[PDB]
Design a protein around this ligand. Sequence first.
Ligand SMILES: *C(=O)c1ccc2c(c1)C(=O)OC21c2ccc(O)cc2Oc2cc(O)ccc21
Ligand SMILES: *C(=O)c1ccc2c(c1)C(=O)OC21c2ccc(O)cc2Oc2cc(O)ccc21
Lengths: 63, 65, 65, 65, 16, 16
Amino acid sequence: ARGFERGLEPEKIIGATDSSGDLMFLMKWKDSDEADLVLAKEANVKCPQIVIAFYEERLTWHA
Amino acid sequence: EIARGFERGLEPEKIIGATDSSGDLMFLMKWKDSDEADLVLAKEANVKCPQIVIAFYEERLTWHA
Amino acid sequence: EIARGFERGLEPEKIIGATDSSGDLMFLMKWKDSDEADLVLAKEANVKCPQIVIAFYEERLTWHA
Amino acid sequence: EIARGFERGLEPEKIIGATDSSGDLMFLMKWKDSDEADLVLAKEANVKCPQIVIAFYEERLTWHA
Amino acid sequence: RQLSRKASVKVSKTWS
Amino acid sequence: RQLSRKASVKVSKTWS
Ligand SMILES: *C(=O)c1ccc2c(c1)C(=O)OC21c2ccc(O)cc2Oc2cc(O)ccc21
Ligand SMILES: *C(=O)c1ccc2c(c1)C(=O)OC21c2ccc(O)cc2Oc2cc(O)ccc21
C-alpha cells in the first residue's frame, strides 16, 4: 500500500534518480514521516508545482 | 511596456532560455505562431504553463558526483 | 537612466558575496555608509580595489588533496 | 645566504601553490623567463604583485556539490 | 543577453 | 542560487 497511492499531500522532493530505468522522486509527504519514491511523470501531473520547486533550486548555467 | 510578455495573449509554445541577472528568474518564452520571443517572470510561467517549465527543466538534467 | 553599479561612485568597504551565473564573475560589493549593495564586474574590482578582492578570497580559502 | 626570495629581482609570472605549513601563508612563485621557482611570503605578494595573487585565487573560487 | 548560456539543472544520486 | 551562499577558494595541499 505504498507510493503516491497513500493519498498524502506532497510536501517536498528531496532527491531524484533514474537508476530504476524511470525518473523517480523521493517525496516527503505532509503529516507523515515515512517518505517513499514516486514516478516523475506522475508527479508532473499531480503536483507540478512541487516538481517545479525541486528543479528550480537546482538551476545552473554551464560554459 | 506597451505590448510585452504574457499580455500579448498568445499561447506559450516553449521556453528557449532563462536568466536571473535582474534579481528574479525569468524565462525567454517563444510563443506559438509568433517568432519574436520575450521575457516572462518565472513565478508567472510556473503558474500559467506549468508543463512548459517542467518540460524545459527535464531536457536540461545533469548528474553530479 | 538609473545606473547604480561600480559607477555609484561610493567607496568600497568589503565584498559580501559572489556569483558567476552569468558568463562573467561578479562580486556583491558593500560600500561605506550605505546599505544598498550592488553587483560589480569582478575584472573591474580586481583592477580598482585589489586589496578588497584579495581580502575577500583570503577569508574563505580551504585545502583539498 | 639571503641571496634568494623576492630579492632574486625577477618579474613574477604566476603562483604555483600555497601552504600554511611554516605557520604563515606562502605562495610558491614562478618567475618570468626562469624555471627555478621559490617561495614568497603571502603578505608581500599581496602588496607587490596583487594581480598575480588575485589571478591565483580567482581560478579556484567555488560554491560546491 | 550574456545569460543565454547552457542552462543545466543539476541533479545527483548521492542520497540513497 | 550561488549568491547568498558562502564561496570557498579550493587550494591544493600538495601542488597547484
Ligand atoms: C541577457 O540575456 C540579459 C538578461 C537580462 C538582463 C540583461 C541582459 C540586461 O542588461 O538587463 C537584464 C534584465 C532583463 C529583463 C528585465 O526585466 C530586467 C533586467 O534587469 C537587469 C538588471 C541588471 O542589473 C542587469 C541585467 C538585467
Ligand atoms: C543555484 O541555483 C544552484 C543550483 C544548483 C547547485 C547549486 C546552486 C550548488 O551550489 O549546488 C548545485 C547542486 C544542487 C543539487 C544537487 O543535487 C547537485 C548540485 O550539484 C552542483 C554541481 C555543481 O558543479 C555546481 C552546483 C551544484
